[PDB]
Design an enzyme around this catalytic site. Structure first.
Site: not given
Ligand SMILES: Cc1cn(-c2nc(Nc3cc(C)c(OS(C)(=O)=O)c(C)c3)ncc2F)cc1CN1CC[C@@H](O)C1
Length: 262
Positions: A15, A16-18, A35, A122
């Site tokens: 979607l 620091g690589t999630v 994560k 953050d």
């Molecule tokens: C630590 C972490 C937890 N999550 C989480 N992320 C989501 N939902 C979600 C859903 C989508 C569709 C995403 O991709 S995106 C850029 O919108 O197309 C992303 C990046 C996340 N749910 C629970 C989490 F716990 C994301 C992260 C990474 N973060 C670092 C960048 C920030 O945008 C989000």
């Protein structure tokens, strides 16, 4: 707190690589965001999990557990709509009243965090995740710190890779991080929201942003931003830590304004 790897299924693409995943729990699957880690960063991930494990609030991303396999992995509940900044970027039709709802929810989550004596360090629109268009959760506790019982701030050692544009002067100048410094970030976060996910201090280096703030200058009012919300941003950007409001005061102001406008 330890999860079973055979019960976790990850989608390939990050979607620091999630990554997105599904984790069978009991009789049903639960959709998850995990994560994934890529030899001292091991402790950092487990610190993050330790923080999340101690938090329980509607407006905070809940950790499901940790998984020692393959790479070290932190499994969280999935918020489908994703980051607030990108969502508002792609949905310019969202109404100010809906943005107030969302940022107010963030302030309740942050009020809880302050009451619990944790600093996020953050806070940014990128780390607000939408469960639905009317439900936001704070994410990314990788930099968070539990405050000591006798202190109201955390003192960093050196200046690492820092999101300088969300940081209060006292963070930049003295490495001091309190709930009040999270309030400053919350101000920037509000700016981002009402600018439909535009980047703050566009085109400026961190050093130039710091010089701008030092001259008493601040970002402008976003197009169509309610005046009371812009005034709140400026209050969040109070230079002196002691005169800047805490989250109780910020949440109260947002709640009263939200309730009065709906
Ligand atoms: C630590 C972490 C937890 N999550 C989480 N992320 C989501 N939902 C979600 C859903 C989508 C569709 C995403 O991709 S995106 C850029 O919108 O197309 C992303 C990046 C996340 N749910 C629970 C989490 F716990 C994301 C992260 C990474 N973060 C670092 C960048 C920030 O945008 C989000």
């Amino acid at each position: 707190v330890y999860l079973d790897r055979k019960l976790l299924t990850l989608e390939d693409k990050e979607l620091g690589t999630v990554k997105k995943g599904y984790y069978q729990m009991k009789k049903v699957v639960k959709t998850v965001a995990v994560k994934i880690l890529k030899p001292a960063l091991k402790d950092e991930l487990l610190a993050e999990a330790n923080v999340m494990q101690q938090l329980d609030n509607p407006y905070i991303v809940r950790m499901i557990g940790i998984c020692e396999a393959e790479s070290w992995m932190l499994v969280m509940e999935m918020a489908e709509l994703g980051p607030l900044n990108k969502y508002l970027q792609q949905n310019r039709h969202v109404k100010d009243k809906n943005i107030i709802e969302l940022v107010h929810q963030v302030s309740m989550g942050m009020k809880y965090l302050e009451e619990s004596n944790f600093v996020h360090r953050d806070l940014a629109a990128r780390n607000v995740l939408l469960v639905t268009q009317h439900y936001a959760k704070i994410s990314d506790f990788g930099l968070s710190k539990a405050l000591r019982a006798d202190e109201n701030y955390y003192k960093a050692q050196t200046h690492g890779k820092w999101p300088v544009k969300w940081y209060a002067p006292e963070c930049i100048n003295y490495y001091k991080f309190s709930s009040k410094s999270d309030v400053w970030s919350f101000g920037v976060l509000m700016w981002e929201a009402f600018s439909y996910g535009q980047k703050p201090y566009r085109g400026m280096k961190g050093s130039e942003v710091t010089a701008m703030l030092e001259k008493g200058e601040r970002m402008g009012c976003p197009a169509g931003c309610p005046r009371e919300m812009y005034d709140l941003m400026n209050l969040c950007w109070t230079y002196d830590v002691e005169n800047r409001p805490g989250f109780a005061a910020v949440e109260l102001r947002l709640r009263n304004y939200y309730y009065d406008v709906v």
